[PDB]
Structure formats: structure tokens, C-alpha cells
């Protein structure tokens, strides 16, 4: 509109209205020029291309993009406490995005006639990089100014080489809106229908569903021999009841398993050898081995073991100001899934035992361990929990088939997720004036809630702040102004029957 | 209801996570209901 | 930490009505103890 009139205001707040919540967040961003306005082929060979597991081919682009895909972008630590204590489920409904108050600089002075190119990809024609849990998100704390990440993508490779099937994409080929310091940009988005995320834990376990007071009318095989001696074979049968709960017939079995190596936080219990990569669970795709991370949803450990964690099984967050490489275990936050041990097998345990032979007069019954177990009819399981620091949605790959599309790192799987929003400085002339832009961004997401109907008599487990005195307030700034989040917060506190 | 603008999470009343022989605010093996502790009303905070 | 004498009634705060003394219980609303001292409680000042 004009140079001397603001194109948008500052909106950050949370409206709690009935069964819905509306979160609003505004931040300040700074957008540099990437690749000196160029597209550049990238691969592993420029880095030496030693490992075939790490081989890649693709292109870096001059464009940047916006990422709000973590929960702490949209929720304050208090609002997150209000969500997880008071509700069984939630899910996003509507999305509103606004880009305004554009300011372009020259290297420092304004360039008033410069433009900013911004488009959203609503046909999903570009590679979708938002569901990989990359850094670069809107900062959790509203006063921090953040840098817009550079957009890049990977396509098919043979070693570091490309193939004839490899697609090249120029983002200039898309129609894009151009903004000066008086223009603004906005659009709305509608989440496709997804199931509620389950922010609760079961107060029952899959094997304990029975009435403890009453026998079943079904019989099991109690004895195959009368006693010690020769030719003592017999078949004896017994009622399954409160005395023996292991042998009772059941209608539903626990979910699938792919076993993880077990690692103790007490280090002297670990074997004295380098097992990180070699002892890892992994899958193979076209000869390349990728670690299974985080993998299928499984309980992190049995009750009474907090020290063990699956090697690649759990999401591990770094604390504020944690280094990049080879940091100690006190620098990171290892999430655990203790609430799914009711319906889900333990990650570091076998699924069970199976009969491996035909017994006979000359051969004993032999059994073997099930290390991995696919889906069987009659299974029930829980998905992975979501965290304040964690991802929200992912794009379901477009394929002939999939099963239970919920993304393994957690959150809401979608065939049409919130679209990629691409942004860059329009070049002002291979010699170019050095230039960058800054502005504001506001994002508004509407969240549907599922209220808690429980008849439980005794009080629930709630997420609480600890009262005892400390040098700092948790989820606040320190004396140097740094904001930090001291611990990961899951969503599962309230309980439901199984 | 509270409209509070506090950024950091509040203090809440919560039952203990750890294992115990009995459940707090429940019956025992003999059918005796019991209240293990007094519960006041003041957890959330306001500015003065 | 308590004194070795009986002061439950004698050391009590109280009010008098028509000659009859009544313990001041629980009394006006006041903080039970200073910050950091959880082991001290007002004699008649608390509900038990």
C-alpha cells in the first residue's frame, strides 16, 4: 500500500473457547541471499563420497522456506500444560498464514523499490522437506528473531551420480507473488480430517482385561506327563481362572515388534566395544542401509528399568546450547514411552516364543524367539507420543499402498499437509547488489479438543511445575536473556480404560 | 476461569506416579476408604 | 526443638467472653510459617 503505513499488527495469543483452541504466533524473521542467487548441483562426492549409505544427489536452491511444524511454535509452556492435563485428544483444524511488514536492506540502508518473491506450493509439485524434523523452525519464545532456512532437495542417485529418472526443479518456474515494503501476503489452509492424537495413557493392560473373580469356561492343557518315570505320557486339562492368568484365552494381542538393542545410561553396564552403528537395528533400501529411527512405537523399557533405552528407538532432544557432535548424555534429553507398555511390546525385548518343531516320542518340544513381528489380526497398539518440542505433521508419501499412515516420529500423517511456503529476495543486478530482507510472520491454527469424560474416583497424574527454589524459572530466560526448555513434555497424563 | 498470561507452566495438584501397596483415595483390602492427605484449593496463580 | 514444659493451654492465644476464655482457633488468616521453615506451625492457628 504505502511506505509509511504498517501492513500488519502483532498477533500472539491463545483463545480457549469450549471444545476448540485458537493459537496465534508472530515472529520477526531475516532472509539472506542464498547461493548468490544461483542453483547449484550438490552431491556426496564434493564431500568425498566415502560411504555408500550416506550417498546422495540433489540441488540447493536460492529460495528459503518457512517452518512452523513443531508444537512449541504454536503453544506456550503454560498453554501446553492446559492442553495435556485437561484433554484426551486434539487435532488441528484450520490454518491461517500472514506475511507482512517487509523491509529490504542494502549492504545499511533501505531499498524501497526492491521486491520479495513468495509463493506457496498448494499442488505439492515440489519435494516436501518439512516432515524430516529439520531445524529452522519459528523460535519457541516470541521475542527471538530467527533466520529463514535454505531450501534444498534430494533426487535419485547412483553413488554421487544422477540417473535419467532424476528430476530437476526450478522454483522460478512457479508463479509467485512479488512484494514491496507496502505489500503483504496471506492465505488460509484447511487440514484434512485426521484422527485425534491420544493424549492419555491406559489404566489397564492388554493381558489384565479379565474379571479377576470369575473362572473362564475354556480349558487349557495342564499336564503332558503323570510323573517321573517311563511311559508316563498323559493329557490333563484345567480351567483358566484367577489363579493362573497367563494361560487364559484372550481376544486381542499386543502390537508389532522390531527389536532394538538395549543401552544403559549407567555406562559400566554397557559392553566395552563400539556397537553404536554395528549393533543397530536397520533396514535396507536399494543396497543402502538406513538405521531404524525412531522405528515402530514400542515401550522404551520395562517397569523398574529407567536406565535402559532403545539404541535408535527414542527421540532425543538437545538442551539449549548443546554442541553438534559427541556431546555427553547430560547434554541431551532422551524421551521415553512408558505409557504404551500396556498395549505395546517392549522395544528391547522379543515379541515372544513360537514352536519350532514337531514333537514326538523321540524329540522334545523346541521353541524359538520372535525378534521381529509384523501385523497379525487382532492386534491393538498405540502410536508414538507427541512433545512440546516435537514435530506436528508429516506428508504421507504418495504410493500404491500404506498401513496406519501415522508418521513414526510422531504426530499427524496427511496426504495433503500444510503447504511449503517458499520465499527469496528478487535479485537486483552475475554481479549483484548485496541485499537481504526482514519482516514479520503471523500463523494461526485452530485446534479441536476431545474432553475427558472419566468416572475415575482417585485423582489423575498431572503435569506440574516443581515448587522448590531454584536459581532460574523453568521455561523462562536466564540472566543473559537465553530462553531454554529444560525437559521434554509429553501429552499423556490422563487415563482411559482399555 | 483464569485468563492468565503466565508463560511458564503452573503448579497443579497431581497424584504420585510411583508404586504403592494401596491407591490414594481408594479402599484397602479390608474395604476401608481413606483420605491420605488434605487438599487445599490454591495452585494456580494471579498477579497481586 | 520444643520447650520441655506444658504450654499447650498455658502458652495459647485466646479471647475472653463474659469471663470464659476460649482458645483462638483457628483465628485470623495468617501464614503458617516463614519461607524455608516447614517444621513450625502455629499452635491454634491451623486446621488439623
Amino acid at each position, epitope marked *: 500500500d504505502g511506505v509509511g503505513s504498517s501492513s500488519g499488527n502483532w498477533h500472539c495469543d491463545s483463545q480457549w473457547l469450549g471444545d476448540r483452541v485458537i493459537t496465534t504466533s508472530t515472529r520477526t524473521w531475516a532472509l539472506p541471499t542464498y547461493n548468490n542467487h544461483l542453483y547449484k548441483q550438490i552431491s556426496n562426492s564434493t564431500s568425498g563420497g566415502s560411504s555408500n549409505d550416506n550417498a546422495y544427489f540433489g540441488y540447493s536452491t536460492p529460495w528459503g522456506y518457512f517452518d512452523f511444524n513443531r508444537f512449541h511454535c504454536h503453544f506456550s509452556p503454560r498453554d501446553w500444560q492446559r492442553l495435556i492435563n485437561n484433554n484426551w485428544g486434539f487435532r488441528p483444524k484450520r490454518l491461517n498464514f500472514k506475511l507482512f511488514n517487509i523491509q529490504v536492506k542494502e549492504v545499511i540502508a533501505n531499498n524501497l523499490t526492491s521486491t520479495v518473491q513468495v509463493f506457496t506450493d498448494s499442488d505439492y509439485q515440489l519435494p516436501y522437506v518439512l516432515g524430516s524434523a529439520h531445524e529452522g523452525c519459528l523460535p519457541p519464545f516470541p521475542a527471538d528473531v530467527f533466520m529463514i532456512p535454505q531450501y534444498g532437495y534430494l533426487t535419485l542417485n547412483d553413488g554421487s551420480q544422477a540417473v535419467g529418472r532424476s528430476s530437476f526443479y526450478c522454483l522460478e518456474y512457479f508463479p509467485s507473488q512479488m512484494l514491496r515494503t507496502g505489500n503483504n501476503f496471506q492465505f488460509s489452509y484447511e487440514f484434512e480430517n485426521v484422527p485425534f492424537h491420544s493424549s492419555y495413557a491406559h489404566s489397564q493392560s492388554l493381558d489384565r482385561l479379565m474379571n479377576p473373580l470369575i473362572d473362564q469356561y475354556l480349558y487349557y492343557l495342564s499336564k503332558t506327563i503323570n510323573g517321573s518315570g517311563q511311559n508316563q505320557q498323559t493329557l490333563k486339562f484345567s480351567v483358566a481362572g484367577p489363579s493362573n492368568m497367563a494361560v487364559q484365552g484372550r481376544n486381542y494381542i499386543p502390537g508389532p515388534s522390531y527389536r532394538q538393542q538395549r543401552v544403559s545410561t549407567t555406562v559400566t553396564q554397557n559392553n566395552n566395544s563400539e556397537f553404536a552403528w554395528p549393533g543397530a537395528s536397520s533396514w535396507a533400501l536399494n543396497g543402502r542401509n538406513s538405521l531404524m529411527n525412531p522405528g515402530p512405537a514400542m515401550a522404551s523399557h520395562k517397569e523398574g528399568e*529407567d536406565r535402559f533405552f532403545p539404541l535408535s528407538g527414542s527421540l532425543i532432544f538437545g538442551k539449549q546450547g548443546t554442541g553438534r557432535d559427541n556431546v555427553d548424555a547430560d547434554k541431551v534429553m532422551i524421551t521415553n514411552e512408558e505409557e504404551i507398555k500396556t498395549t505395546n511390546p517392549v522395544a528391547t525385548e522379543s515379541y515372544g516364543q513360537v514352536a519350532t518343531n514337531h514333537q514326538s516320542a523321540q524329540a522334545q518340544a523346541q521353541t524359538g524367539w520372535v525378534q521381529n513381528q509384523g501385523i497379525l489380526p487382532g492386534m491393538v497398539w498405540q502410536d508414538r507420543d507427541v512433545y512440546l518440542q516435537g514435530p506436528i505433521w508429516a506428508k504421507i508419501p504418495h504410493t500404491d499402498g500404506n498401513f496406519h499412515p501415522s508418521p513414526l516420529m510422531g504426530g499427524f500423517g496427511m496426504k495433503h499437509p500444510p503447504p511449503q511456503i517458499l520465499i527469496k529476495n528478487t535479485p537486483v543486478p552475475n554481479s549483484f547488489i548485496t541485499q537481504y530482507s526482514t519482516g514479520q510472520v503471523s500463523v494461526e491454527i485452530e485446534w479441536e479438543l476431545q474432553k475427558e469424560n472419566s468416572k475415575r474416583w482417585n485423582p489423575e497424574i498431572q503435569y506440574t511445575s*516443581n515448587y522448590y527454589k531454584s536459581n532460574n524459572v523453568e521455561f523462562a530466560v536466564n540472566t543473559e536473556g537465553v530462553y531454554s526448555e529444560p525437559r521434554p513434555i509429553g501429552t499423556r497424563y490422563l487415563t482411559r480404560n482399555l | 476461569k483464569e485468563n492468565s498470561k503466565r508463560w511458564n507452566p503452573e503448579i497443579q495438584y497431581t497424584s504420585n506416579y510411583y508404586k504403592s501397596n494401596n491407591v490414594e483415595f481408594a479402599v484397602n483390602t479390608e474395604g476401608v476408604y481413606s483420605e491420605p492427605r488434605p487438599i487445599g484449593t490454591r*495452585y494456580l496463580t494471579r498477579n497481586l | 526443638q520444643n520447650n520441655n514444659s506444658e504450654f499447650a493451654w498455658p502458652g495459647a492465644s485466646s479471647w475472653a467472653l463474659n469471663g470464659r476464655n476460649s482458645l483462638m482457633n483457628p483465628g485470623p488468616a495468617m501464614a503458617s510459617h516463614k519461607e*524455608g521453615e516447614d*517444621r513450625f506451625f502455629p499452635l491454634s492457628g491451623s486446621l488439623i
Partner: antibody
Amino acid sequence: QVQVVESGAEVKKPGASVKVSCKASGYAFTTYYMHWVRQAPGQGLEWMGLINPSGDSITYAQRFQGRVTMTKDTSTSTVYMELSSLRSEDTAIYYCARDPNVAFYYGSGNYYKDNAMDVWGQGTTVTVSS
Amino acid sequence: QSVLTQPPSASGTPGQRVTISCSGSSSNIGSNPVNWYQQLPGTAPKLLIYSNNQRPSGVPDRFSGSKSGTSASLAISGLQSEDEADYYCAAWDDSLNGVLFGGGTKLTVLG
């Protein structure tokens, strides 16, 4: 003055049962908690059990549950500790400790009783050997 | 899975400050009061600090106690030869549902 006279040293074989008595005098026996804590010859302290001022409620360390018994005698002002099915590792010194914190504090968050024991008994050396 | 851990040894010279710390689980140090015991060789343990920072009567002012988060520390200042003893940090543990002691920290004066 307050005193906690610990019993005499003994020598026991595996499988035997040893009872250590603790005689308090100079204060009110009923009022305080009594803690039992063992210390191996070269090792740190290990808490065994607890008995409340009334004698009705007793808590044990999980390691010792079912092989330990504690009883309090108001008449002679003596607390006793029972250890059964003795093992080589059992050999230790057994301390009897008085706990002056009578009540629970119910603040915001979980409640707690302060378990600090001011008066300690001299100790008894129990050896489990053949 | 809940443990109390202290460094096995400490050292200092008379008059220097020496701090002894132990690390605890959320169930014990985090939610319960921490008490400190000092034990000289051949004698029963003596309570030094109770209820995190409180000091019992007849105990010298130089000893100090602090609790931060899930970690508890004991500070000794104006150190002397007599002070040298084994130090244990203790706390009630909810999961254990009993009292839990640290491994003990043997202090060694220099001279």
C-alpha cells in the same frame, strides 16, 4: 541424657537368625521413630527398616522384606530387629537411630516427612561365618 | 532405577572450602528433603544438615547445605583436620518407599 544402648556383638552361621536389641532411656520412647541401618565393614550405610512412634506401622527396605522383623517394647523401652536366613554378606554393624521428626508436611506437591535421625546407637557387630 | 551418587573422595587444605555433592533421581532428591551425615572412623554417623539447609543445634556454622533441582550439595568452609570423615547424603525415595543413602564421600585433608 538421651542414650541408645546397642546390644552385644554376636557370631552366627548361615541360616541362623539374629535379633539385635536397642534400649533407649532418658526421653519419651513412644514419641519418636526408630531407624535400623547396617554398614558393611568396608561399605557405606544401608537403610533397613522403620518403626513408627506407636509401633503399629513398620516399613522395610525391599531387599529385606520377608526376612526382617521389627518390634517395639514400650515396657522396657527397647526396639528389636530380626534378621533371618543369614548370609555371608549380612555381616555388618547394625545401628539404631532415633528420628525426632513427628509429623508430615502437606505443602503443594507431594507430602513428606523429614527422615533425619539425630541420635545413633553405638552399634553391634554381627558376623556371619562358619 | 533411582540412585544417589557422590564422588568417592574429596581433598582440601585447612581453611579452604570443600563442597561435596551427590546426584539423585526425581523421586528422591527432587521431591524430598535432603539430610547430611558425617562419620568419623570407628564411630556412628552424626547428623550435619537436615531439611536441605537446616542445621541441628550443636553443629558448627561452617557446614552448609544446598539443594538444587535433583542435585544436593554440602559445603564445608574453614576446613580443619578434625573435619576429615566419610560424608553421606541421604533422602527418602518414593519409588523405593524407604530411605536411600549415597555411597559416601571420604574427605582427605592435606598435610
